Amino acid sequence: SKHTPINLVRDLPQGFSALEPLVDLPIGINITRFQTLLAL
Amino acid sequence: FQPTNGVGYQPYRVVVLSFELLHAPATVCGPKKSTNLVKNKCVNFNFNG
């Protein structure tokens, strides 16, 4: 993951930005599908 | 029973800690006792393995 202030909204910002490791949990189970969660 | 029960009849507390080695992560390491640090000498070093 990474964080940075931006100004673009509808398109990706122009440039490069590395993502540093944050978690490497050895969960040890299969993953095939996923879903997101939102705050309303 | 009695607080001073003899062997064989007194309560026997057992723990059966079981070593499992499978697809699960293997956080198995050695009995490494951390040593001090030296410098400016030819030395056989070992850091985190």
From Swiss-Prot, chain A:
Changing residue 9 to G: In strain: Omicron/BA.2, Omicron/BA.2.12.1, Omicron/BA.2.75, Omicron/BA.4, Omicron/BA.5, Omicron/BQ.1.1. Glycans are attached at residue 30. It comes from the Viruses. Attaches the virion to the cell membrane by interacting with host receptor, initiating the infection. The major receptor is host ACE2. When S2/S2' has been cleaved, binding to the receptor triggers direct fusion at the cell membrane. When S2/S2' has not been cleaved, binding to the receptor results in internalization of the virus by endocytosis using host TFRC and GRM2 and leading to fusion of the virion membrane with the host endosomal membrane. Alternatively, may use NRP1/NRP2 and integrin as entry receptors. Binds to host ACE2. RBD also interacts with the N-linked glycan on 'Asn-90' of ACE2. Cleavage of S generates a polybasic C-terminal sequence on S1 that binds to host Neuropilin-1 (NRP1) and Neuropilin-2 (NRP2) receptors. Interacts with host integrin alpha-5/beta-1 (ITGA5:ITGB1) and with ACE2 in complex with integrin alpha-5/beta-1 (ITGA5:ITGB1). May interact via cytoplasmic c-terminus with M protein. May interact (via N-terminus) with host bilirubin and biliverdin, thereby preventing antibody binding to the SARS-CoV-2 spike NTD via an allosteric mechanism. This is Spike protein S1. The lineage of its organism: Viruses, Riboviria, Orthornavirae, Pisuviricota, Pisoniviricetes. The gene is S.
